[PDB]
Design a protein around this nucleic acid. Structure first.
Ligand SMILES: [Mg+2]
Ligand SMILES: [Mg+2]
Ligand SMILES: [Mg+2]
Ligand SMILES: [Mg+2]
Ligand SMILES: [Mg+2]
Ligand SMILES: [Mg+2]
Ligand SMILES: [Mg+2]
Ligand SMILES: [Mg+2]
Ligand SMILES: [Mg+2]
Ligand SMILES: [Mg+2]
Ligand SMILES: [Mg+2]
Ligand SMILES: [Mg+2]
Ligand SMILES: [Mg+2]
Ligand SMILES: [Mg+2]
Ligand SMILES: [Mg+2]
Ligand SMILES: [Mg+2]
Ligand SMILES: [Mg+2]
Ligand SMILES: [Mg+2]
Ligand SMILES: [Mg+2]
Ligand SMILES: [Mg+2]
Ligand SMILES: [Mg+2]
Ligand SMILES: [Mg+2]
Ligand SMILES: [Mg+2]
Ligand SMILES: [Mg+2]
Ligand SMILES: [Mg+2]
Ligand SMILES: [Mg+2]
Ligand SMILES: [Mg+2]
Ligand SMILES: [Mg+2]
Ligand SMILES: [Mg+2]
Ligand SMILES: [Mg+2]
Ligand SMILES: [Mg+2]
Ligand SMILES: [Mg+2]
Ligand SMILES: [Mg+2]
Ligand SMILES: [Mg+2]
Ligand SMILES: [Mg+2]
Ligand SMILES: [Mg+2]
Ligand SMILES: [Mg+2]
Ligand SMILES: [Mg+2]
Ligand SMILES: [Mg+2]
Ligand SMILES: [Mg+2]
Ligand SMILES: [Mg+2]
Ligand SMILES: [Mg+2]
Ligand SMILES: [Mg+2]
Ligand SMILES: [Mg+2]
Ligand SMILES: [Mg+2]
Ligand SMILES: [Mg+2]
Ligand SMILES: [Mg+2]
Ligand SMILES: [Mg+2]
Ligand SMILES: [Mg+2]
Ligand SMILES: [Mg+2]
Ligand SMILES: [Mg+2]
Ligand SMILES: [Mg+2]
Ligand SMILES: [Mg+2]
Ligand SMILES: [Mg+2]
Ligand SMILES: [Mg+2]
Ligand SMILES: [Mg+2]
Ligand SMILES: [Mg+2]
Ligand SMILES: [Mg+2]
Ligand SMILES: [Mg+2]
Ligand SMILES: [Mg+2]
Ligand SMILES: [Mg+2]
Ligand SMILES: [Mg+2]
Ligand SMILES: [Mg+2]
Ligand SMILES: [Mg+2]
Ligand SMILES: [Mg+2]
Ligand SMILES: [Mg+2]
Ligand SMILES: [Mg+2]
Ligand SMILES: [Mg+2]
Ligand SMILES: [Zn+2]
Lengths: 118, 119, 56, 142
RNA sequence: AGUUACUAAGGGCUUAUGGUGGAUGCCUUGGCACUAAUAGGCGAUGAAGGACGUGUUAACCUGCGAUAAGCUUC
RNA sequence: GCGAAACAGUACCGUGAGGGAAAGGUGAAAAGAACCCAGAGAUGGGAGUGAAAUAGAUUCUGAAACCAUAUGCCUACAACGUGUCAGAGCACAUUAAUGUGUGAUGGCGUGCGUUUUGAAGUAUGAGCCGGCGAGUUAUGAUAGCAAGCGUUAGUUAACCA
RNA sequence: AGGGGUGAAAUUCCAAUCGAAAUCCGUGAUAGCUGGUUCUCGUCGAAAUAGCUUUAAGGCUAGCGUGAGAUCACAAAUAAG
RNA sequence: UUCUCGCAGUCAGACAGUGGGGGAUAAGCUUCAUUGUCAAGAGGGGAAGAGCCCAGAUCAUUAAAUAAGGUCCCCAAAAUA
RNA sequence: UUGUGGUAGACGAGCGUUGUAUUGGAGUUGAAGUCAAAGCGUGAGCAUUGGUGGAUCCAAUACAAGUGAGAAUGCCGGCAUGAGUAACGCUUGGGAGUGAGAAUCUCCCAAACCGAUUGACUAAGGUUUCCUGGACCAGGGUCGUCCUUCCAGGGUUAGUC
């Protein structure tokens, strides 16, 4: 019983080739280089999901910090005032407010500024 | 690299000029390469102007250049030059020969040229 | 000396970018009309107004 | 409406033939013939014969005007090669590959001929999607 | 003074097509391993194996042996 | 699969003993393309036969590497394991899906196997693609799991039909 | 004519090969030494130590892993005295 | 982590702190005892680093609080005295 | 509720290929193969449609294996890179002609080398390479209308060698 390989190697090879579509030259043509690039690309994608979670936080912090310095308050004290006033809002939504709703963002800063903590 | 070909020696160049000038004086047209026609033209013009007096000294000078051809010998080419060709150019201030460029050869792409006696 | 790394199919074409050919300038004969490359005797042996060679 | 002519196993190499084919693509009939008749290259007296045969079977077989023909695409595909053994020095040997080219010239009368080719490609894609939708309708029907 | 598109000699990506190439799939006057029987030899009455030749038929293959692509008998 | 599906122990290699290949498939039927056009001709384009000629003797199907053509996007101040996460603009419309093709720009980023305490490696192996290519069989021993038969149990080997 | 020949002797020559030709066979010699060994997922997960070894690039037993079973406290860990 | 049975792999280790031997209170040296990491372990700090510090990655989330480390710009985040 | 980094290694659960046995089913109104697409799965993997293709194939439960290729300076076949790069292995000019096409073929005139030889007769070896006509698949390191290449016909005469 001589089992002969055909359509088994080609199908699993073409899957890797399909994944590595849009690469530079031989990186999409040859199966070997395509397989290496897909594995490396998967590693990159894994690492950059974690790094995206951190980098977008940093960007929101930067935007919020800037929005506060125009009014004379700093980020380091704004978050402290937020905690003492029990207000719980993401820096993402706060930055979205300062870019989309200047009046309501200014309302939040006014309350945290001076109103009695709790 | 050794055992190279003799090459385009000075003696070979003089012999080449001699053969083409003898032929162009015998027949009246030569279909050669352009760079060879542009070198044979000088000797052709020099021979024609020196053969305008027809003295025995001028025959001795020409005989150092003429060679035997099919249509004329080395002695009948002398009669053709001194009695038929040269007397025609008796008051022309030079420029007895014209060189014009034909197309490239099929096997070399070199520029051919026809050298003729300008009437 | 020999290449320690294989040259891709892109560097090859970049080098060949200067290997393109040029169209030789052509003109029209003034007695028969066929195109001949410039400054050269036509196929009829008629250059300008001078009969150079016998007709082809 | 494309008329065409072909030549299998042309002795010229594809590398040395594409250089001449790129001098005639997009050119008018008379100008292409004039350009190719005075170029000092080996692959010029063979593309000329193919071009002339293509004009003949365009204005005789397919019925084209003859004053609107332009060279649509002239290419030299890779042909079958021939292997020979060149004797080297010190007893070694190498393989000489005699290269051949499959020449094909195509001329059209319509200056917008690329659009129809893209249209046919689009029609094939549309028929595939249409088949998928009819199959989906059949699946939901049952 | 300031912010500005068109360039593509050439190249890159996607898709479609053409060409070189014979992988995969289907098949086989071919191989392999055995079963049940038969048989287990040919040769000086010239053996096994070859050379040569033989056509109404180019060569090759096969058959045949000056009775030479076949002869006689049942 | 015999080295040999074909005229294989042939072609070929060696003084010799000896060594030793590759190569199959038109179509139901040659009905194998008369004839016309270009060409010197092969040949090609029509015509004709045929269900099919993109089945045409290069003759079942025709993959990838490889070479060319083109719709769309980007690219000539730019430091690049060539990708990934965000991201304008451009062009389309699908196994209708927070759609697809390209990617100005920003953040991050020194291949795969091997062998080593330790390899991006100035260690090693692979030019690319496709096929082939390395834990088996026979006879016994031990152990795990499961079934049959059981307390004078259990089970046959050769051989015969 | 090859554990042989020839050698005015160099390990010369013996069919482009000679510290002992070429070819076939035993033969699929042996190699504690390199290289290679092909589908997936889940649970757990080491060692580079001791003794012996004509042993030191290897092997055997012990130590460390894993699967099954038993031991419930008198067994084994973490703190205080 | 004790006892019994089946199957192993391992016998080339490296560095950091601490106590020593050899060296010269030299070595990214060599040989031991012990605590850790790497081997077989990514992430953050150290500008870049197998072994140092903080810790232990099941997958997705553009949610929040923190460890070592840090807050003029590169590069997230500070002010007073 | 406690967990889910992982090499050597141990254990468990599955995918896929070929064939056989039982059931059922599809197929010239188009099977396998093969290409493309914007699908489904935790993974091996599995579908749908359209093009090409022309006759076998699929599902379930079991059984038996030449059953899974990325690496062995692995074997075979094809194709790249180097690269249109090195090289093309001692000998000139012209006139006329043939031819579809001529530096290369034929004739003529020169020209240049050999001339104890590139001259002439034969031994050995080669085995038709010899002569005539035709051809330009392949070979000729370019070209070719030409060849020691190919096709057809022909050619070797002993009493004294
Ligand atoms: Mg395989
Ligand atoms: Mg001299
Ligand atoms: Mg390209
Ligand atoms: Mg160039
Ligand atoms: Mg030799
Ligand atoms: Mg090559
Ligand atoms: Mg261009
Ligand atoms: Mg492009
Ligand atoms: Mg022989
Ligand atoms: Mg046809
Ligand atoms: Mg082919
Ligand atoms: Mg075919
Ligand atoms: Mg720019
Ligand atoms: Mg600058
Ligand atoms: Mg830099
Ligand atoms: Mg960058
Ligand atoms: Mg980037
Ligand atoms: Mg980088
Ligand atoms: Mg591997
Ligand atoms: Mg090492
Ligand atoms: Mg080392
Ligand atoms: Mg490097
Ligand atoms: Mg080295
Ligand atoms: Mg090594
Ligand atoms: Mg290498
Ligand atoms: Mg391979
Ligand atoms: Mg048992
Ligand atoms: Mg002995
Ligand atoms: Mg000695
Ligand atoms: Mg010898
Ligand atoms: Mg062996
Ligand atoms: Mg041994
Ligand atoms: Mg664990
Ligand atoms: Mg340890
Ligand atoms: Mg220890
Ligand atoms: Mg050892
Ligand atoms: Mg042990
Ligand atoms: Mg130690
Ligand atoms: Mg030690
Ligand atoms: Mg220490
Ligand atoms: Mg010390
Ligand atoms: Mg010390
Ligand atoms: Mg050390
Ligand atoms: Mg290790
Ligand atoms: Mg780490
Ligand atoms: Mg760091
Ligand atoms: Mg964990
Ligand atoms: Mg905080
Ligand atoms: Mg802190
Ligand atoms: Mg900052
Ligand atoms: Mg695990
Ligand atoms: Mg099956
Ligand atoms: Mg199909
Ligand atoms: Mg196998
Ligand atoms: Mg090569
Ligand atoms: Mg090349
Ligand atoms: Mg170079
Ligand atoms: Mg050069
Ligand atoms: Mg050169
Ligand atoms: Mg020569
Ligand atoms: Mg010469
Ligand atoms: Mg002399
Ligand atoms: Mg002689
Ligand atoms: Mg012969
Ligand atoms: Mg002859
Ligand atoms: Mg002849
Ligand atoms: Mg030739
Ligand atoms: Mg007589
Ligand atoms: Zn003219």
């Amino acid at each position: 019983m001589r089992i002969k390989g055909g359509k088994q190697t080609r199908v699993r090879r073409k899957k890797w080739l399909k994944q590595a579509s849009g690469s530079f030259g031989t990186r999409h043509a040859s199966y070997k280089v395509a397989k290496q690039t897909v594995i490396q690309a998967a590693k990159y994608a894994y690492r950059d999901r974690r790094n995206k979670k951190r980098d977008f936080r940093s960007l929101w912090i930067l935007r919020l910090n800037a929005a506060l310095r125009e009014q004379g308050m700093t980020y380091s004290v704004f978050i402290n005032l937020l905690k003492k006033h029990n207000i719980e809002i993401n820096r993402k939504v706060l930055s979205e407010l300062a870019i989309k709703e200047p009046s309501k963002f200014n309302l939040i800063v006014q309350k945290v500024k001076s109103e009695q903590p709790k | 690299s050794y055992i190279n070909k003799p090459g385009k020696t000075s003696a070979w160049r003089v012999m080449t000029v001699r053969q083409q000038v003898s032929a162009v004086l015998a027949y009246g047209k030569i279909e050669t390469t352009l760079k060879k026609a542009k070198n044979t033209q000088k000797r052709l013009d020099k021979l024609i102007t020196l053969a305008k007096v027809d003295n025995f000294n001028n025959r001795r000078q020409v005989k150092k250049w003429l060679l035997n051809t099919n249509l004329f010998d080395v002695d009948q080419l002398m009669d053709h030059l001194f009695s038929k060709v040269a007397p025609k150019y008796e008051k022309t201030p030079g420029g007895y020969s014209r060189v014009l460029k034909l197309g490239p050869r099929r096997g070399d792409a070199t520029e051919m040229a026809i050298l003729q006696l300008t009437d | 000396a020999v290449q320690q790394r294989r040259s891709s199919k892109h560097r090859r074409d970049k080098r060949r970018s200067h290997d393109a050919l040029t169209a030789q300038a052509l003109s029209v004969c003034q007695k028969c009309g066929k195109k001949k490359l410039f400054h050269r005797v036509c196929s009829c042996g008629m250059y300008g107004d001078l009969r150079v060679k016998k007709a082809y | 409406m494309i008329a065409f002519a072909k030549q299998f196993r042309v002795r010229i190499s594809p590398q040395k033939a594409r250089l001449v084919c790129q001098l005639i693509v997009g050119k008018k009939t008379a100008d292409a013939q004039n350009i190719l008749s005075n170029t000092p290259k080996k692959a010029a007296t063979l593309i000329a014969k193919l071009l002339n045969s293509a004009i003949a079977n365009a204005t005789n077989n397919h019925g084209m005007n003859g004053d609107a023909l332009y060279v649509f695409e002239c290419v030299a595909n890779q042909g079958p090669s021939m292997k020979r053994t060149i004797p080297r020095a010190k007893g070694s040997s190498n393989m000489i590959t005699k290269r051949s080219s499959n020449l094909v010239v195509k001329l059209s009368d319509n200056p917008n001929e690329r659009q129809e080719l893209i249209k046919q490609q689009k029609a094939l894609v549309k028929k595939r999607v249409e088949g998928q939708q009819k199959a989906k309708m059949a699946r939901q029907k049952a």
